[PDB]
Amino acid sequence: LDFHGQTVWVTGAGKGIGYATALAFVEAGANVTGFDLAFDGEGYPFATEMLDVADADQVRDVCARLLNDIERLDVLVNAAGILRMGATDQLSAEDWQQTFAVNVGGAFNLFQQTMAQFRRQRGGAIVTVASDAAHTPRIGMSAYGASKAALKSLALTVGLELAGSGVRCNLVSPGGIPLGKIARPQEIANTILFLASSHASHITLQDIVVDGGSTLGA
Ligand SMILES: [Cl-]
DSSP states (O other), rough: OOOOOOOOEEEEETTTHHHHHHHHHHHHTOEEEEEEEESOOOOOOOOESSSSOHHHHHHHHHHHHTTTOOOOOOOEEEEEOOOOOOOOOOOOOOHHHHHHHHIIIIHHHHHHHHHHHHHHHOOOOOEEEGGGGGGGGOOTBBBHHHHHHHHHHHHHHHHHHTTTTTHHHHHHEOOOOSSSSSHHHHHHHHHHHHHHHHHHHTTOOOOEESSSTTTTTO
């Protein structure tokens, strides 16, 4: 998987899956910019942009400035996300609002700021990190799963809106079934790079569930 010379944006890049994906693209030769609310880790070998991706004004400001400097956005990875659990009737107003603001609104903002670039340049790839909680109901995750189901739906319609421009748009849904140990971020990142790569050039509007089979194919 070679991304030499390609410009790659990754949200949620301060930690977790987003960080692992940003690092994997750096190691594959890409020019990576990571976006996150905080960069509290000890090492970021890529450019960082610290903002609330849930905030449409901040995303507009940062993305417009970056798009003035780059000639192509080769890969966009949406990997922001927060997990707030609870019985539906106990979940706080704050946890409900912030779950949707971050888990759906962030990608919505990124799509609003990048779709014109994808149309202009032709081509490119988008990968969005959903969740297997978007595929089956999970006790304690009603809001999380619902936000990830909205994210998936949004990403698929954006993929249809950009299909005429040659853009591929896919998802990954992380977690004797489950088969194996829980997938670590580095392993999710592998699947993201596959879907962003030329080896996936006729794959679009697909969602690979990486959870050891827990959804039994759903
Ligand atoms: Cl958090």
